[PDB]
Amino acid sequence: LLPDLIAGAHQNADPVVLDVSWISLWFAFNRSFEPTHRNEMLEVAPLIESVYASELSVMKVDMRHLSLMQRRFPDVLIQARPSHFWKAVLNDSPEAVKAV
Amino acid sequence: VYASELSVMKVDMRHLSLMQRRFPDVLIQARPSHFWKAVLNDSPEAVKAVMNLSHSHNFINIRDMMRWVMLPSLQPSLKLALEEEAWAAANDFEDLMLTD
Amino acid sequence: FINKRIVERVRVGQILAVLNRRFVAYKGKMRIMDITQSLKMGTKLAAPTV
Amino acid sequence: WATIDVEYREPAPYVHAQRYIRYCGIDSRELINPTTYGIGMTYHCYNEMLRMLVAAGKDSEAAYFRSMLPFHMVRFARINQIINEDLHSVFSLPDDMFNA
Amino acid sequence: YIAPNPRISSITLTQRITTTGPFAILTGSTPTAQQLNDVRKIYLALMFPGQIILDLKIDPGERMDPAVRMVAGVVGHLLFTAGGRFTNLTQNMARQLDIALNDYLLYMYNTRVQVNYGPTGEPLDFQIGRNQYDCNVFRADFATGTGYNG
Amino acid sequence: QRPERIKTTPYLEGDVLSSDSGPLLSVFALQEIMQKVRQVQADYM
Amino acid sequence: TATFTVPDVQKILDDIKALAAEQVYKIVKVPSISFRHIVMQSRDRVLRVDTYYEEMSQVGDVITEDEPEKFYSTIIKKVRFIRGKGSFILHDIPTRDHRGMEVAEPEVLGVEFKNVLPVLTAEHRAMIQNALDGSIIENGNVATRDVDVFIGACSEPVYRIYNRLQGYIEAVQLQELRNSIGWLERLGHRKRITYSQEVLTDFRRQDTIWVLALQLPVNPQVVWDVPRSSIANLIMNIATCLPTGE
Numbered sequence A: 001l002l003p004d005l006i007a008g009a010h011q012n013a014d015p016v017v018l019d020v021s022w023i024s025l026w027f028a029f030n031r032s033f034e035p036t037h038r039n040e041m042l043e044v045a046p047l048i049e050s051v052y053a054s055e056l057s058v059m060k061v062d063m064r065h066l067s068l069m070q071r072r073f074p075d076v077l078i079q080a081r082p083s084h085f086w087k088a089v090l091n092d093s094p095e096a097v098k099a100v
Numbered sequence B: 001v002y003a004s005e006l007s008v009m010k011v012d013m014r015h016l017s018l019m020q021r022r023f024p025d026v027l028i029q030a031r032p033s034h035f036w037k038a039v040l041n042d043s044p045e046a047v048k049a050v051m052n053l054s055h056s057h058n059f060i061n062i063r064d065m066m067r068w069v070m071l072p073s074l075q076p077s078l079k080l081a082l083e084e085e086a087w088a089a090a091n092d093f094e095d096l097m098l099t100d
Numbered sequence C: 001f002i003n004k005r006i007v008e009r010v011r012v013g014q015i016l017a018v019l020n021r022r023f024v025a026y027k028g029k030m031r032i033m034d035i036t037q038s039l040k041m042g043t044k045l046a047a048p049t050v
Numbered sequence D: 001w002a003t004i005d006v007e008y009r010e011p012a013p014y015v016h017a018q019r020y021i022r023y024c025g026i027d028s029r030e031l032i033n034p035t036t037y038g039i040g041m042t043y044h045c046y047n048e049m050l051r052m053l054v055a056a057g058k059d060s061e062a063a064y065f066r067s068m069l070p071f072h073m074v075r076f077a078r079i080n081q082i083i084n085e086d087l088h089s090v091f092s093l094p095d096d097m098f099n100a
Numbered sequence E: 001y002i003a004p005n006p007r008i009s010s011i012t013l014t015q016r017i018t019t020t021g022p023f024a025i026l027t028g029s030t031p032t033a034q035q036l037n038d039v040r041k042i043y044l045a046l047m048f049p050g051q052i053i054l055d056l057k058i059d060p061g062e063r064m065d066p067a068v069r070m071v072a073g074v075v076g077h078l079l080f081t082a083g084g085r086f087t088n089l090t091q092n093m094a095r096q097l098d099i100a101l102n103d104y105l106l107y108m109y110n111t112r113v114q115v116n117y118g119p120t121g122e123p124l125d126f127q128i129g130r131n132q133y134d135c136n137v138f139r140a141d142f143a144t145g146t147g148y149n150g
Numbered sequence F: 001q002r003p004e005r006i007k008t009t010p011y012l013e014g015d016v017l018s019s020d021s022g023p024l025l026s027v028f029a030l031q032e033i034m035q036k037v038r039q040v041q042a043d044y045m
Numbered sequence G: 001t002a003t004f005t006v007p008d009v010q011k012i013l014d015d016i017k018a019l020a021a022e023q024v025y026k027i028v029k030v031p032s033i034s035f036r037h038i039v040m041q042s043r044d045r046v047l048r049v050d051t052y053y054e055e056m057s058q059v060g061d062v063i064t065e066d067e068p069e070k071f072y073s074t075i076i077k078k079v080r081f082i083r084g085k086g087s088f089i090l091h092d093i094p095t096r097d098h099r100g101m102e103v104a105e106p107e108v109l110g111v112e113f114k115n116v117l118p119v120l121t122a123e124h125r126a127m128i129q130n131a132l133d134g135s136i137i138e139n140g141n142v143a144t145r146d147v148d149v150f151i152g153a154c155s156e157p158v159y160r161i162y163n164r165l166q167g168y169i170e171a172v173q174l175q176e177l178r179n180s181i182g183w184l185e186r187l188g189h190r191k192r193i194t195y196s197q198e199v200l201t202d203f204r205r206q207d208t209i210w211v212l213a214l215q216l217p218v219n220p221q222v223v224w225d226v227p228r229s230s231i232a233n234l235i236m237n238i239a240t241c242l243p244t245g246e
Helices: A002-006 A021-030 A045-066 A084-092 A093-097 B004-017 B033-039 B045-055 B061-069 B079-087 C012-018 D044-055 D059-087 E033-047 E067-079 E091-106 F021-045 G007-020 G049-058 G068-085 G120-134 G154-189 G229-242
Strands: A016-022 C007-011 C022-025 C032-036 C043-044 D006-008 D019-021 E052-056 E115-116 E124-130 G035-038 G043-048 G095-098 G102-103 G140-141 G146-152 G194-195 G208-211
Touching: A016 C043, A016 E033, A016 F021, A021 E067, A045 A084, A045 A093, A045 D044, B004 B033, B004 B045, B004 B061, B004 G068, B033 B061, B033 G095, B045 G007, B045 G229, B079 G068, B079 G154, C007 C012, C012 G043, C012 G120, C022 D044, D019 D059, D044 G194, E033 E052, E033 F021, E033 G120, E052 E091, E052 G229, E067 E091, E091 G154, G007 G229, G068 G154, G102 G146
Parallel strands: A016 E052, C032 G208
Antiparallel strands: C007 G043, C022 G146, C043 G194, D006 D019, E115 E124, G035 G043, G095 G102, G140 G146
């Protein structure tokens, strides 16, 4: 992250920039963050991670299998683009994954 | 903005100065004040006013204007570059659809 | 007499023979904006006083 | 009299003007507090004038000027600040003409 | 969010005599909605080191006494990190903080002290005090992170 | 129940100002991120 | 206290500030038509007509040998017309796909031949379609930004202006913006002004093309080359930078 910011090169994970005021520095210096309770779904999260990863894996598999149709049968897919099967796969996926 | 407008005026005057030598038959009774007034009729009024703050009580003539035109200093900008390329493209008057 | 090709007679095979200019276009998913007016957005610091 | 009222330093934003006005030898880099700034600062001409006034038998006037010295210093500090940090522009006079 | 103890900045020796803090004018202020949102932004940027970066905001109508800027200049050098591993603030905000610290150090509302300026025009290029303390070390340098935490 | 939260000296004891949690801060961050770009695209051509 | 500059200079600065926002270029999807075609009773031959000269012949007044001012004004107006017509930028052009390649649509090419198709025969129609299928789009880079490059038709005098404008856009993308921002930072450091950079720090900043009509490090010499201009410069400096106090 840091050498790319110094050199100004292209970044895959660009940092998010937020704007603050002068007096906000003084207000933030005179405060401390004291946690009281854990998150409500801290004990459930890994199942969410696993479900998300599995659904993305199956989408990748479907797209990979569909990507060879043009080379296999050129005369049927003359006007084909990758975005076409991208939309075709996304139209048959659960809405929660697309929302994420 | 002021520098860009002055540069545009300089370029226009510099290119218009050669017309009498190029076509003696049309401009036989022309004087430099003619093309001076012609260029000043198309400049913005703000730059003319700024110059008139000084020229309202100091006298200048053709020699001062020619010496200022011949000086090699311009402020690069979009309008200046476009105007220079326009003059270069219109160097040949057959492209302006008038001939003898 | 004007030495320009204002009007010509061409066969139908020469219709697409005038394509010799290199054009550069920007992608539709990118954006272009003019930020000249952004060069005057600033604030003036005030000196301390009694 | 014996001060250095103009100075040259690091390059300026406008390259045609590089001078720094230093009335009474006051540096314009630092902010001032008008309540208490010139408590113990003098320069050459003021000291010579005070010495001459004391030598001439004008005690009240000498004491008045010695009391009014901090007012003089803060006023000239404000003038230096205005000249160096507000009146810097392309419309400022070039150095080669200011010296002449 | 927990505020610091009020007795840290003041001691009451007797009924009438109490010590006075330097920043008493600032400690009496109360944040509005926007300032509280900015505080939440600052803490969010702190808790995620390299993924959120702060920057300065300019509002022409907004009005404060100039002391706030030079106090924040000192605060920011102690609160943020611009070291050799990661950063919390953009280069522009680092420059603004350095300029604010310069203005704070050169503002002497008490008896003045000796100062010697350097050959370059960069901010914080001077030596201060009876013992000449070099303040060039507080200028930001992202390759080594001298001026901030780290 | 955690040893880190035991306070024995009033140095670390003070008033309570505000509170926040994950489900609020996430939507706050999204709102600020989108608001910035909408404002920038509105202010200029 | 609870109960300034002369008005004409204030009006002058207001006019200059207004003029600073004038827009010169345009952003279009397709270029204007440069060549059109005239059909006769024939089916194999047509007339190719260049529209530039046809539009150019109707600009300005007639030339007469005893009004030099009108002649100069006519030349100025013609040059300005050329400059105005030649400045445009392309964005989001129509596109078609063919055998895994991208092809420009016939409407983005700078020729108009929609009225010659109905008169053609079968062989010529097939030939025209096959020829149109061969306009392959190329992917190029302009300061690490992906752009489309293709081949079209345009008249020479307007093409020169377009090419110069493209070169200027590339130049301001490479180094001019950084120079302007750095000079603004140095000036603000000198004169105690804080300049905002909010416009360059959103989350869509890695896919933006920046256009600037003016540059910041202005050459002061061009200001001081105006003959006998000391008093005007002094008045402008007073009207621009003098503060007010008690």
